[PDB]
Design a protein around this nucleic acid. Structure first.
Ligand SMILES: [Mg+2]
Length: 439
RNA sequence: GGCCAGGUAGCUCAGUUGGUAGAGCACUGGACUGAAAAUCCAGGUGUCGGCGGUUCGAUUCCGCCCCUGGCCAC
């Protein structure tokens, strides 16, 4: 039930100056875990607290001291957020009450999802170290295993099933047998929890670069298919299409790691700088774009228009899962034009590619260009093209980038403006354009 | 504090490259019928939440706020 500078944080002093003498505080969950696993503290810090005093007051005064922002939400829990450019701080204060402090702490630690997250230390021992792990989290961290405290705790809050999938990949741990068994039983249980949370955990999975294996895990057990029924529809078309999407995602990640070679400088400049949902990038949207790259093949076949229908389906998924409108529109636009570089390459291999089509390409979509390129290369890798084909593709991309880098520098008024911009690349020309427009 | 979605005629709802805000229902009137229902025809001066900015021109593009709701430990 117990065991015995490492857990230190600069802000743990501040909390201590706030928390009253007669009340106690405990550091619980991920932070502790992250410190036990030995992973270096990143640029995003999240600390979880259990206090015997009013968490709202404590948090408000803490934010008062650190000059951060404070908010409360629903028992009722409090949180403080301190955000500057290099780092992000989130401190979540939770209520702890009972006649017996130790018994209350223990009872709380048994209601948590996983053993790793059930470890807690006393705040007074942090700055000066007896640890509380009734679920035996440390022992499981010694074996590198993520083991749910109980299955009833997982059923109590279904969304936890995704965290276990994320954390295992995030902290590099292996999920136990009982978890996979519970997932085998009822994969649909995930749907019981709120949608936006599922969206959040999914995006958190897509954040890391090993995500394709996790996606395969979620698909194979039917969880992914249960959250997104459109994914299963890839099984009715025998190429296997689903395998092709999974491998497209894998190769997409392997390309993302190597992305510095394939793309040019100006394209890589703003790559991954697009903030979606206030913590995520367009890279995750690129991975979603790779999973969804063909969602329309079961829709239309004999797949001529499958990219348009695909864009529509993606739009509906984004609407259904409550993504950002800019996000879902980004992914939909990424699926819509997903086959464009293949037609540009195919027109290049015949030498029939001209500045017209390039101008149209950069006019039509210049924002999704890097992502569309990486996705095209990924799909080319997943299709198993001959060397000549892929080389020709990368050469096509090269000529495109080389083209845009240098050579690109009452409809009456609109048509006039368009014709002017076209003729530019001199008011008499405008007068003549008007005289020609009259006829 | 962060993010997400709505705010439009009386109600409830369309308006994904910008180009005078229309359609259905509801409402009124007429034809028709002993009568009524049905059927057929006609009728929109709406500060597109507020203020600004880009544009020749903004319901749509951009920035700052307002109101309603949804999520935010492990
Ligand atoms: Mg935490």
């Amino acid at each position: 039930x117990x065991x015995x500078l490492n857990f230190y944080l600069s802000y743990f002093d501040d909390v201590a100056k706030v928390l009253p003498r007669e009340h106690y505080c405990f550091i619980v969950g991920g932070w502790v875990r992250d410190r036990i696993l030995g992973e270096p503290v990143g640029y995003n810090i999240d600390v979880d607290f259990l206090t015997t005093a009013d968490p709202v007051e404590l948090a408000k005064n803490f934010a008062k001291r650190i000059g951060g922002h404070f908010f409360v939400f629903e028992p009722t829990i409090a949180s403080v957020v301190l955000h500057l450019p290099p780092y992000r701080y989130r401190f979540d204060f939770s209520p702890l009450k009972g006649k017996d402090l130790e018994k209350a702490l223990i009872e709380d630690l048994k209601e948590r999802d996983f053993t790793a997250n059930a470890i807690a230390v006393n705040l007074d021992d942090v700055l000066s170290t007896i640890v509380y792990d009734p679920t035996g989290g440390i022992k499981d961290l010694e074996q590198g295993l993520l083991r749910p405290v109980s299955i009833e705790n997982l059923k109590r809050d279904p969304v936890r099933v995704l965290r276990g999938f994320r954390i295992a990949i995030e902290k590099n741990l292996q999920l136990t047998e009982d978890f996979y068994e519970f997932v085998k039983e009822d994969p649909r249980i995930v749907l019981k929890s709120a949608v936006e949370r599922i969206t959040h955990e999914l995006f958190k999975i897509m954040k890391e670069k090993t995500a394709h294996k996790v996606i395969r895990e979620l698909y194979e057990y039917g969880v992914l298919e249960a959250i997104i029924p459109e994914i299963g529809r890839l099984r009715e078309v025998k190429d296997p299409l689903d395998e092709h999407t999974l491998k497209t995602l894998e190769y997409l990640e392997q390309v993302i790691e190597d992305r510095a070679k394939y793309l040019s400088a100006e394209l890589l400049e703003n790559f991954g700088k697009k903030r979606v949902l206030g913590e995520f990038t367009d890279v995750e949207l690129l991975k979603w774009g790779a999973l969804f790259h063909d969602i329309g093949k079961p829709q239309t076949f004999a797949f001529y228009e499958h990219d348009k229908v695909g864009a529509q389906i993606v739009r509906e998924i984004g609407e259904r899962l409550r993504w950002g409108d800019e996000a879902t529109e980004f992914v939909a636009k990424l699926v819509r034009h997903h086959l464009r570089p293949f037609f540009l390459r195919e027109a290049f291999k015949k030498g029939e590619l001209k500045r017209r089509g390039m101008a149209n390409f950069w006019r039509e979509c210049g924002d999704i260009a890097p992502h569309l390129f990486l996705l095209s290369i990924a799909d080319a890798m997943a299709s198993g093209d001959e060397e000549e084909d892929i080389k020709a593709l990368m050469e096509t991309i090269a000529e495109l980038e080389s083209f845009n880098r240098n050579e690109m520098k009452x409809x009456x008024x609109x048509x006039x403006x368009x014709x002017x911009x076209x003729x530019x690349x001199x008011x008499x020309x405008x007068x003549x354009x008007x005289x020609x427009x009259x006829x």
